[PDB]
């Protein structure tokens, strides 16, 4: 956060905890908004043999 050391110390004392560690606002730890393309797997019935529907 863009908070000065005096303000950070006052905030931590008033709260009683280290707020600068577990900040609620998200800055950079979020995942990227442009993720690589995926490749999802097929299910257990995507086989060319021994897969008659009467058995499942």
């Amino acid at each position: 956060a863009s908070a000065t050391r005096v303000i950070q110390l006052l905030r931590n004392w008033a709260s009683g905890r280290d707020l600068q560690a577990k900040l609620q606002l998200r800055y950079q730890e979020i995942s990227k908004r442009t993720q690589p393309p995926p490749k999802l797997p097929v299910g257990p019935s995507h086989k060319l043999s021994n897969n008659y529907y009467c058995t499942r």
Partner: protein
């Protein structure tokens, strides 16, 4: 008897297989044909049927059904409709050329067989359905039938027995499916060569809606010799329930391809190495052999080493006797390519009526082409096996079974080659 596979020339039914004698009436009579035919007909249908049953004769068409009971199916009181005998001379099974020799070089034997069979089944006439490509053979058969008519052997008062009988030759038009009995009946009736659905069986409703019996050329031509020389003599050759003398066509990679009338239950190795000079390059160069044409699954060299050429022995060997067309492939043969070509043949010779046949045969053809190219995956072999099993038993004709069986045999006996070729294709790309 214990060991079979050595027939003496005195016992061979077809004594003019190679056309080294006259194929006309004089030659046939000199070779024993038409002897005491009047007495055979005057014996009665029951006597002829009993002789056929005692001979242990089984169908030479490929089904191997007991001939005696099949013919006796027609032995019923007349219901006001005529009865016919139909001779299956289509001979479309790849590797099968035995009926061609019978028609071309021993035609009077076939005519006498038609007469005897019609007397046994009380058939008014006989429609011989010869292959359309067999035009010279059809001409020879027509000449023989004309000679029989002139001599009084057939026609009104056939051989003086008081039995009226006609023999008709109907040429084919180029359909392998017309080899099927019901499809042949449909072709004779003038429709498309699409097999019927049983029941009704031909013995009740057949050609023109009349009781009928379809039979192979060899099965009909061996009947006069069975009646004359005796059922016991015919049964004396071959194993029990596999009795008789069988015509064999030995094609493929053999030194001397030919056709010989050996005894049933002859060892396959003895048949190949004696009458054909063995496999090209020796018996140690034999990859696989198709024993019964194309509809029968292949067998590897290990099976071919000790196997008898009869119905039961080949049935135990996960194959069939069929038309006894021994296709021989050496170890230089692309077995996958050969099986793919057979499946392509079945694709091009499919009536296209039943859904499993029409769709699945083409599907398997495409899959086999991709296997030949190697452009597939190892998981597709079991898929192809399942497709073949879905085709087999679920069709109208047995052409579905006849197209599934080669694939099943290939998958059963050479799966490592398929997987290896798939690996080769994968590595190259």
């Amino acid at each position: 008897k214990t060991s079979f596979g050595s027939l003496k020339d005195e016992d061979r039914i077809f004594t003019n297989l190679y056309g080294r004698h006259d194929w006309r009436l004089k030659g046939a009579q000199s070779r024993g044909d038409w002897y005491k035919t009047k007495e055979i007909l005057l014996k009665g249908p029951d006597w002829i049927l009993g002789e056929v049953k005692t001979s242990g004769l089984r169908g030479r068409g490929g089904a191997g059904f007991p001939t005696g009971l099949k013919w006796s199916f027609m032995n019923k009181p007349s219901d006001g409709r005529p009865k016919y005998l139909v001779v299956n001379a289509d001979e479309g099974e790849p590797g099968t050329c035995k009926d061609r020799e019978i028609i071309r070089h021993d035609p009077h034997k076939l005519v006498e067989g038609c007469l005897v069979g019609g007397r046994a089944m009380g058939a008014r006439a006989a429609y011989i359905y010869i292959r359309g490509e067999f035009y010279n053979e059809a001409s020879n058969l027509q000449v023989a039938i004309r000679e029989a008519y002139e001599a009084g052997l057939i026609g009104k008062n056939a051989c003086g027995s008081g039995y009226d009988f006609d023999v008709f030759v109907v040429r084919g038009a180029g359909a392998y499916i017309c080899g099927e009995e019901t499809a042949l009946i449909e072709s004779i009736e003038g429709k498309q060569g699409k097999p019927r659905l049983k029941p009704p069986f031909p013995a009740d409703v057949g050609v023109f809606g009349c009781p009928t019996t379809v039979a192979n050329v060899e099965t009909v031509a061996v009947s006069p010799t069975i009646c004359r020389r005796g059922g016991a003599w015919f049964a004396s050759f071959g194993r029990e329930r596999n009795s008789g003398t069988k015509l064999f066509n030995i094609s493929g990679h053999v030194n001397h391809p030919c056709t010989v009338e050996e005894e049933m239950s002859v060892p396959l190795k003895e048949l190949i190495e004696k009458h054909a000079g063995g496999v090209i390059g020796g018996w140690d160069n034999l990859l696989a052999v198709i024993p019964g044409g194309s509809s029968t699954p292949l067998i590897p060299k290990s099976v071919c080493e000790t196997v008898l050429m009869d119905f039961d022995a080949l049935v135990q060997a996960q194959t069939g006797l069929g038309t006894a067309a021994v296709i021989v492939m050496d170890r230089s043969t692309d077995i996958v390519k050969a099986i793919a070509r057979l499946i392509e043949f079945y694709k091009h010779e499919s009536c296209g009526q039943c859904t499993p046949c029409r769709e699945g045969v083409d599907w398997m053809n495409k899959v086999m082409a991709r296997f030949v190219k190697g452009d597939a995956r190892p998981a597709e072999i079991d898929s192809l096996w399942e497709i073949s099993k879905q085709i087999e038993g679920h069709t109208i004709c047995a052409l579905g079974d006849g197209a599934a069986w080669p694939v099943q045999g290939l998958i059963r006996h050479f799966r490592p080659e398929l997987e290896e070729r798939m690996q080769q294709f994968a590595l190259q790309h």
